[PDB]
């Protein structure tokens, strides 16, 4: 009984979870990856349509007020993003929802932008190194990143130690999970940061200090014969 133990000792049940080749896939991804691109932009006051082409993947990480417990975006603000305006007809979304009303309002968003939810990925936060919301019945120890599909390996669990207070960063494992899906190479990360910039991704955010985005230069990476690469194969 790891729930009785947590009651007794303060160690969250997850602390006691233990633990081919592949690896080739990871170098195929890394060789296919476009140069990192990044653009600072106040997404609220930003016509999201300036980001072309349509994206095969969108990773959406709005700064919810709940992440600052000790500008925040409300699900009011998020729902009004025109994400369907920049999503390819067949495309995926990965939306970080936290652990409160975002688990409900995030599903509204996905449906409003045209997706259906095919996976629920949980970030489970251990507290091995340091053994509440008014509506909360339980202590909240995880975050949900919902995966959506619009159009026609790994587990759904990320286990890391809980980050120190005021650190809003999400586990870098979400990128490996996403990139192992081999969904294409047009990858957009909204509300990314200098710290999250990554080969094979376009990163847009208000706190970026530098930008290098050029629509025509960006679009040049996916022109023929490279238009339909999964991102998991050899250079055309």
């Amino acid at each position: 009984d790891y729930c009785q133990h947590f009651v007794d000792t303060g160690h969250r049940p997850q602390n006691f979870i233990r633990d081919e080749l592949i690896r080739l896939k990871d170098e195929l991804i890394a060789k296919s990856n476009t140069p990192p691109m990044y653009l600072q932009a106040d997404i609220e006051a930003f016509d999201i349509r300036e980001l072309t082409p349509k994206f095969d993947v969108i990773l959406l990480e709005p700064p919810l007020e709940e992440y600052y417990r000790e500008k925040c975006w409300t699900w009011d603000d998020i729902m009004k993003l025109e994400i369907d305006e920049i999503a390819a007809p067949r495309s995926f979304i990965f939306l970080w929802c936290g652990s409160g009303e975002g688990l409900d309002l995030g599903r509204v968003c996905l449906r409003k932008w045209g997706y259906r939810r095919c996976e629920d990925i949980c970030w489970i936060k251990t507290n091995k190194n340091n053994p509440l919301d008014p509506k909360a019945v339980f202590q909240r120890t995880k975050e949900h990143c919902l995966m959506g599909i619009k159009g026609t390996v790994d587990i759904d669990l990320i286990i890391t130690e809980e980050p120190e207070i005021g650190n809003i960063e999400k586990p870098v494992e979400i990128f490996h999970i996403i990139e192992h899906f081999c969904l294409g190479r047009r990858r957009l990360h909204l509300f990314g940061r200098d710290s999250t910039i990554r080969p094979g991704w376009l990163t847009v955010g208000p706190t970026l200090t530098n930008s290098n985005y050029n629509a025509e230069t960006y679009a040049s990476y996916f022109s023929a014969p490279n238009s339909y690469l999964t991102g998991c194969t050899e250079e055309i």
Binding site: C3, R12, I17, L132, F138, Q139, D156
Partner: protein, 195 residues
């Protein structure tokens, strides 16, 4: 009252009005991922409680449908428990990702008072017993949250019987009841014992 009680029945056709009010409801429905979605929606969940909590196991598209029933029945989802499935070595045992877990939505209704909010955390780590069995840790968590109160499980199996719980499910062994008030209304509503 306090010892295990149960009722073999079809929850679609049982007049649950005879059972009274409970501090906690748990359900592990046979989602069509069987009861059709309309049958799930028309279950008379609302009569079971006035103030308290609902625990509702969801998977696949029931993650969205269950939220619908939850709001339909008159609840607000305030939490979501995940059960991480392990083996005996505590290693981890949906066409896109392998599934390490089961979800259980927590609903609140009314304004319950005197409950022990915050005693456990929303993650269960426990070994998979028989297939389709749920971990007994959930009963421990539910008891610490509302000690000594009336509880009812819908679509439970024989092993699910627990003190303080009435268990409704169609693969139970007949009708076993002990709370006098329930005994009463059951004989009044079902004088001949069929349903």
């Amino acid at each position: 009252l306090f010892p295990p009680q149960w009722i073999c029945c079809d929850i679609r056709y049982l007049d649950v009005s005879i059972l009274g009010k409970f501090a906690v409801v748990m359900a592990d429905p046979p989602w069509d991922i069987t009861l059709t979605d309309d049958e799930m929606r028309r279950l008379n969940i609302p009569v079971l409680q006035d103030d308290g909590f609902l625990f509702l196991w969801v998977t696949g598209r029931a993650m969205e449908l269950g939220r619908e029933c939850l709001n339909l029945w008159g609840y607000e989802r305030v939490d979501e428990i995940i059960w991480v499935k392990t083996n005996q070595l505590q290693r981890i045992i949906g066409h896109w990702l392998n599934h390490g877990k089961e979800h259980c939505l927590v609903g609140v209704k009314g304004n319950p008072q005197g409950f022990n909010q915050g005693l456990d955390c929303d993650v269960i780590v426990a070994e998979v017993r028989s297939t389709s069995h749920k971990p007994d840790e959930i009963y421990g968590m539910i008891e610490r949250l509302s000690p000594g109160t009336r509880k009812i499980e819908l679509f439970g199996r024989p092993h699910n019987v627990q003190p303080n719980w009435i268990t409704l499910g169609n693969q139970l062994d007949g009708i076993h009841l002990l709370d006098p008030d329930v005994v009463a209304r059951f004989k009044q509503r079902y004088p001949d014992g069929i349903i």
